Amino acid sequence: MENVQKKLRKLERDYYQIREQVVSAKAGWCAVMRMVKDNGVERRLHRRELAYMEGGALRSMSDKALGALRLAVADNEHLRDALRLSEDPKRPERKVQFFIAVYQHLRERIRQDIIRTDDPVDAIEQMEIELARLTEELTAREQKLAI
Amino acid sequence: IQSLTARAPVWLAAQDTLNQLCEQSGETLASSNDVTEYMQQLLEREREATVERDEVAAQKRELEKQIERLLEALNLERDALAERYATLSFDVQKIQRAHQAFSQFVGKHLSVAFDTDPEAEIRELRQRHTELEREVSRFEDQTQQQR
Amino acid sequence: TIEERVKKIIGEQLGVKQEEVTNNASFVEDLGADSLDTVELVMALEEEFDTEIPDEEAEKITTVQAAIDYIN
Amino acid sequence: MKYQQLENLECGWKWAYLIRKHQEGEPITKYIENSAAHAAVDKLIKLESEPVRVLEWIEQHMNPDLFNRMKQTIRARRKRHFNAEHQHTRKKSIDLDFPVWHRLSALSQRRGNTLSETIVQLIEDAERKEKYAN
Amino acid sequence: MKYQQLENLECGWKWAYLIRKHQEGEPITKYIENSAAHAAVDKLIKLESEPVRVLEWIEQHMNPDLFNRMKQTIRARRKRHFNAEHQHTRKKSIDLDFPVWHRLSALSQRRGNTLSETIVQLIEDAERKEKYANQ
DNA sequence: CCACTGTTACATTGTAACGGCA
DNA sequence: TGCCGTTACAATGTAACAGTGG
Numbered sequence: 162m163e164n165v166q167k168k169l170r171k172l173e174r175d176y177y178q179i180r181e182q183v184v185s186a187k188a189g190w191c192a193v194m195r196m197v198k199d200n201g202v203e204r205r206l207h208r209r210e211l212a213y214m215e216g217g218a219l220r221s222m223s224d225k226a227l228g229a230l231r232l233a234v235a236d237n238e239h240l241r242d243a244l245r246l247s248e249d250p251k252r253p254e255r256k257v258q259f260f261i262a263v264y265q266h267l268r269e270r271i272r273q274d275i276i277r278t279d280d281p282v283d284a285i286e287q288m289e290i291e292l293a294r295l296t297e298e299l300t301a302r303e304q305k306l307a308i
Numbered sequence: 309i310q311s312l313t314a315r316a317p318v319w320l321a322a323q324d325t326l327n328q329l330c331e332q333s334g335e336t337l338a339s340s341n342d343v344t345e346y347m348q349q350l351l352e353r354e355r356e357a358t359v360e361r362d363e364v365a366a367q368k369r370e371l372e373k374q375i376e377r378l379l380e381a382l383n384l385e386r387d388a389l390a391e392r393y394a395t396l397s398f399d400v401q402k403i404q405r406a407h408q409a410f411s412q413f414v415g416k417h418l419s420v421a422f423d424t425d426p427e428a429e430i431r432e433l434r435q436r437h438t439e440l441e442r443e444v445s446r447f448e449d450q451t452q453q454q455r
Numbered sequence: 456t457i458e459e460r461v462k463k464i465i466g467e468q469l470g471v472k473q474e475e476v477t478n479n480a481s482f483v484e485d486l487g488a489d490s491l492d493t494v495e496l497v498m499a500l501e502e503e504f505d506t507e508i509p510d511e512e513a514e515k516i517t518t519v520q521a522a523i524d525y526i527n
Numbered sequence: 528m529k530y531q532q533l534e535n536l537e538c539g540w541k542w543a544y545l546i547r548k549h550q551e552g553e554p555i556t557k558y559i560e561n562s563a564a565h566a567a568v569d570k571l572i573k574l575e576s577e578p579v580r581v582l583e584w585i586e587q588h589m590n591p592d593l594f595n596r597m598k599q600t601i602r603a604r605r606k607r608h609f610n611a612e613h614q615h616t617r618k619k620s621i622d623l624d625f626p627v628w629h630r631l632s633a634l635s636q637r638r639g640n641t642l643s644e645t646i647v648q649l650i651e652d653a654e655r656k657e658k659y660a661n
Numbered sequence: 662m663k664y665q666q667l668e669n670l671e672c673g674w675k676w677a678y679l680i681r682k683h684q685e686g687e688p689i690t691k692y693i694e695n696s697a698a699h700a701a702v703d704k705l706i707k708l709e710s711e712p713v714r715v716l717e718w719i720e721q722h723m724n725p726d727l728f729n730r731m732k733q734t735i736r737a738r739r740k741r742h743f744n745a746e747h748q749h750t751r752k753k754s755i756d757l758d759f760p761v762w763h764r765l766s767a768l769s770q771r772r773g774n775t776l777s778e779t780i781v782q783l784i785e786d787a788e789r790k791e792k793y794a795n796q
Numbered sequence: 797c798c799a800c801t802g803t804t805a806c807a808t809t810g811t812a813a814c815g816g817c818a
Numbered sequence: 819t820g821c822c823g824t825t826a827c828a829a830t831g832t833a834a835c836a837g838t839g840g
């Protein structure tokens with residue numbers, strides 16, 4: 162029975178390790194949850210469809226998205242730097258910051274003179290309107306130049 | 309729960325696009341009959357807009373030729389026609405884009421659209437696992453003591 | 456004093472600040488922490504004080520004040 | 528294979544490692560003539576943001592003698608990157624005075640244990656002696 | 662001061678530190694303007710073979726942030742350079758698993774002594790057991 | 797007081813040597 | 819054998835504490 166007591170002690174130390182894991186995880190979650198509440202988590206990040214997918218596939222999906230972002234963000238330099246920093250696995254919050262750093266940047270370059278939608282996802286429609294208008298202007302300009 | 313869990317991811321993704329698609333429109337989709345009704349509203353809007361788009365295009369071409377032969381009043385009208393033509397041009401594009409999403413939405417997700425949330429059942433059934441566990445303990449206790 | 460532990464940890468586990476919690480309120484509904492969050496809070500309290508709290512006693516911490524009542 | 532390998536991550540690791548080595552003066556390329564080496568290094572520098580082509584660059588121009596060092600560096604990077612997620616799998620680095628380290632390594636070699644195992648055993652024996660006395 | 666300060670060595674150390682920091686991308690300069698920063702870095706590069714002028718370049722263009730890190734790194738480098746002479750003054754680097762290091766650090770903080778002293782005490786108790794077994 | 801120096805406890809990255817396994 | 823995890827270092831950079839003298 163003393164061996165069973167020692168086994169219980171082993172179980173208790175394993176429990177101690179698991180509890181430390183969980184409490185540290187929540188301590189980390191605190192700030193990321195506080196910052197993501199700027200509409201980030203409402204529907205964008207929390208793709209609840211993925212709640213039933215093993216981390217093995219999620220890692221590959223994030224890796225593929227990172228590969229695409231490398232090419233996409235080549236022109237920008239501050240966004241490139243933020244993406245570079247966001248690869249550390251011991252500073253999770255940085256990833257969310259990058260998302261914010263995108264939207265904020267995507268909000269600065271809106272050229273709000275003729276656009277209003279703060280959310281860039283809805284700025285695509287106004288951009289398409291702008292391209293149509295500019296194509297008509299291009300036709301008019303070409304005719305004037307010819308004459 | 310093993311069956312329901314396998315059902316959660318497909319259902320969950322299907323409704324998430326619906327809500328995103330719902331946000332793209334001014335109405336709420338909660339039935340197959342409603343979807344067809346809104347789709348026809350979408351299609352009829354499409355036919356009307358192209359008729360008006362063609363109408364304004366006829367007006368623009370006539371005014372463009374009038375200016376070509378030659379004035380400011382003609383330029384002012386042409387600019388107004390370009391503004392109206394652009395405004396109606398995007399309307400046809402958006403309505404066509406909205407229909408395409410609806411067609412794809414019904415092509416793929418119509419099998420599980422507007423269905424019961426399997427997460428709720430999984431939550432309830434899993435809650436029965438624990439409440440069943442009490443029956444395990446309170447019948448294990450009886451056999452431990454009475455013996 | 457020693458309560459600074461609890462009134463600190465609570466916030467660190469719920470996203471609220473030290474003074475946000477009110478003794479009259481309840482964690483379950485008046486702080487926004489759901490079942491999982493309250494389990495995490497009680498278990499973090501268990502970790503901090505290097506002690507144990509069974510399920511029955513642990514379930515009696517739904518109110519803010521209780522977190523200190525069993526401690527002191 | 529214990530840790531899954533991700534291409535867009537390990538390729539960035541390899542590019543960074545090669546750029547670091549080049550900045551340190553190490554000969555990255557197999558070309559003794561300086562012109563070809565400079566051309567290959569420029570190709571690598573402008574090759575940023577590409578896994579599928581940095582792999583080919585390594586296959587084509589990489590110095591033969593650096594393959595083993597790069598492979599083991601990437602091995603260590605992968606293991607550390609995956610282990611740094613949880614506290615218990617991390618490693619704590621300390622500096623020990625040479626006499627103390629000499630004695631500890633003597634014990635570890637004598638008993639066949641590692642430094643971590645040796646310290647665990649020593650602490651456990653100290654605790655057992657405490658309990659004996661107490 | 663226990664370690665002799667050598668000017669022509671520490672100046673080279675400082676110059677190398679500045680160059681490493683710059684090539685790593687950090688803003689060693691105190692200038693926000695791009696042109697002045699580039700000119701200052703170029704002058705520092707020219708100062709490669711004149712470590713003596715590096716002190717003046719530091720006082721003229723060094724970022725105010727880096728003084729503490731500078732005084733830390735060169736101080737540590739001096740200590741290490743002078744200790745490397747003899748083995749018995751050297752340091753050995755080892756890696757410890759989190760549980761083992763946690764227990765060891767808790768024990769050391771309990772006894773109020775450094776890690777090497779705690780390891781000495783543990784190995785000395787083990788060696789005392791071995792000695793009394795030997796006698 | 798204040799600054800400068802010595803020391804310890806980490807982190808960060810790289811490398812060589814073992815040993816397991818297809 | 820060649821890849822892959824793992825250990826035990828080396829070299830350098832930093833933060834924090836303890837001393838020392840101006």
Ligand SMILES: *P(=O)(O)OCC(C)(C)[C@@H](O)C(=O)NCCC(=O)NCCS
Pocket residue numbers: 438489490491492494
């Ligand atoms: P709620 O929807 O936040 O879910 C809470 C939970 C079921 C995930 C779980 O954290 C919980 O609160 N369980 C109750 C305690 C329990 O089940 N203990 C089992 C000990 S073996």
